[PDB]
Amino acid sequence: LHALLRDIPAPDAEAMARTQQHIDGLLKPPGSLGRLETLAVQLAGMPGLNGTPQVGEKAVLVMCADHGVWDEGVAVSPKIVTAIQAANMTRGTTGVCVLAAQAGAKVHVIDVGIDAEPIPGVVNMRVARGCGNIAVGPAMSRLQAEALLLEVSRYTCDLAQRGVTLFGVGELGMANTTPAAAMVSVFTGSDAKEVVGIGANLPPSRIDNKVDVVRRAIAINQPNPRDGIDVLSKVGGFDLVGMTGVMLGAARCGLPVLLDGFLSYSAALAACQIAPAVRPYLIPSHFSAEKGARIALAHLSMEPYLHMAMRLGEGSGAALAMPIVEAACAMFHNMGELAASNIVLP
Amino acid sequence: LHALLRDIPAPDAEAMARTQQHIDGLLKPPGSLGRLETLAVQLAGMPGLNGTPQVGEKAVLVMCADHGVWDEGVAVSPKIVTAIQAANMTRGTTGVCVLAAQAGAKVHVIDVGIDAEPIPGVVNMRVARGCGNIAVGPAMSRLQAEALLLEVSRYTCDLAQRGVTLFGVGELGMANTTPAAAMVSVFTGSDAKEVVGIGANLPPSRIDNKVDVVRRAIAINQPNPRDGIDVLSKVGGFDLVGMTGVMLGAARCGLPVLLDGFLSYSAALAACQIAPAVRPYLIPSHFSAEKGARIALAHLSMEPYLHMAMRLGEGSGAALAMPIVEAACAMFHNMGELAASNIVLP
C-alpha cells in the first residue's frame, strides 16, 4: 500500500502546455469555451491518457455495503434495500444503470459489505456483513480498511488494462449519509449540525437524532483528522472505503475519475488526505442537494458542472457527466483552427 | 402572425399529472432525481411530444446576421468573421457543429442578414446586408421584424414535420452582445452598466464606450418595454429576431427549445413579452459568463443546469445540454419500479 501511494504519477505539465496552445488556436475567441477548455487541459496532463484529452471505455464502480448505525434510526429506508438494489444493479433497472447506458458506460457492482447472502452477478469483495455501529465504536479495524483499499485499487487499475480510461464512482448503502457527514465534519472541522442532511427523505423531526448520532461517533472514536485511514476505519464504512479505493487506484493508473454526490465528496476528502497527489485526477460532476455539499466541495476546492438538485447517489451524477468529458475531447480534436480561416484576433 | 400567437397550445396538465405519478413510483427515493424529474414532467406537458417525455430528431438553428452598431467600436472581432464562420458552419468545424455532432443533432445555418454575398449551403432568409446602427436609429422597420418572425416560425414548425422534436437556438453576429444588452436593459429595467459585458474579449478599457452606445440606442429609439416587437425592431437585430422566431415556432408546434447563452436570453425575454404562452416550452442550458446573465435569467425565472463559464455562443451550450434532456427521457422510460421490487417507502 505504501508502494501504491508512493507511485501515483504527477500530472504531465509538458502535455498540458501543448494542450493549452492547441486550444488557444481553435476556431473561437480565446477562452470562450471556459471550463470545457480547462477540463480538456486537465485531462491532457493525466499520464494514463497518453498526452491528449481522450476517452476510451467508461465504467462506473458502485460500492455496496450495510452500516450498523442503521439501528440508531438515522434512515427510513428498510435495511434490506441495499441488497435488493444491488441485485437490481445486475438487471440494469436502477438510476445509474439507465444513465450509464445512455453515456455508453458499463456499471460494475461491487459488494464490499452487504448484510445479506452473496448476490450472484455482483463482484464479491465483502469484508463482513455490514460494518460496526459507529455510534458505539469503530466501523472496522485499520487493517480491514487498508486491505480493502488495496483490493479495490488493484481492481480499478486492472480495468485500465481492459481499455477503461474514465471512471465514475458510486455507492449503495442504507444510512450511509450518517458516516459521510461524520467524515466531512472531522475533515473540515465543521459542526455536525452544518453537514447533516435528510439523506433518503428522513423526516425533519428525526434530524436532531441524526446530528446527535454523528457527534457521539466522533466523540467515542476520536478519529485523527490528519490520518485519512484512521477516519475511514473509525467513522466511515465499507462503501466509503471502497470509493476512496477507486480514487487511489485511478490516480495510481494516471486516469480520471468522476465524483458523484455527497457520499463521494466524503471519500474524496479522505483520499486527498491520504495522498494529495490524487487531487489532479478528480473531476466533479454535479452539486448534490445534500446539506453538507457546499462545505465538502469548498474544502476540495471543486465547482461541479451540473446543478440538478440530485440526491439519489449510486453514481448517477457521475454517469450524467460523462458526456461532458467526451465533449471536451471532441472540442479538442474536431474543431477547426483560426489560422486556417485566416481569422486574426487581438 | 396574430393567428400564430393565438394558436400556441397551453401545456397538457393531464399528461403532466400522469407523468408525475409514474416518476414517483420509479426505483428511487421520491424526488431524489430532482430537476431531472421536473424536466421530464415539463416535457410530458408539451403537446407536440404526444403525452410523454421523448426525444426524436434534434436540430440546432443558428441565426446569422451583421450589425451596423459594429462601426461604433463595440466589438474587436473583424466584421467579416460573421460570414467566414457562417461558411465554416457548413463544413462542421465550428464549436456548435462539433458539440451537436456529439449529441446527434443536425445544425441548420440560417442567414437572416449577413453583410456579405450569399453563402452556398446556408439557408437564405436575409432581410438586408446587416441591420441599421441602433446607436443612431432603429435596427429595422416593424414590418421587417414581423415578416422575419413569421418566416422563421414557419420554417421551425415545418421541421417538426420531419421528425424534429427538440430544438436548440444559436446565433452568429459580430457585435450582437450590444443589442442584446440594450434589450435586456429595456425589458428588465436595469441600468446599461449592469448588463453590458465584454462579449468576444472586448478590452476592459473599451467597456465604457459600449455602455454609452447602449444608452444612446435606448434614448434615441425609445423602445416600448411592453411591446416585444417594438423593442426587437428598434434596438435588436436580425439574428435576435430570428432566435425569437424559433421560440415562437417551437411553441406553436408544442415542442421544446433549448436556450443557449446571453444572446438567447435576450430573445427569450422578447418572445415571452410577445406571447407569455411561450414560456412553458423554453428549457435553459447553461449559465453564460456574460455579465448580464444573472439579471436576464432572474427575469425569465430560469436556473440553468450547466455552469461551464461558456461565452462562445453559436448555440454551443444548447447542444451540450441535449444529452440531459435525453437523460430525463431515459429515466422515465427505462427505470424499474419500486412496487416490482416489493420496496415500500414512507
Ligand SMILES: c1ccc2[nH]cnc2c1
Ligand atoms: C471569432 C471566432 C469564432 C466565433 N464564433 C462566434 N463568435 C466568434 C468570433
Ligand SMILES: c1ccc2[nH]cnc2c1
Ligand atoms: C431506496 C430505493 C432506491 C435507492 N437507491 C439508492 N438508495 C435507495 C433507496
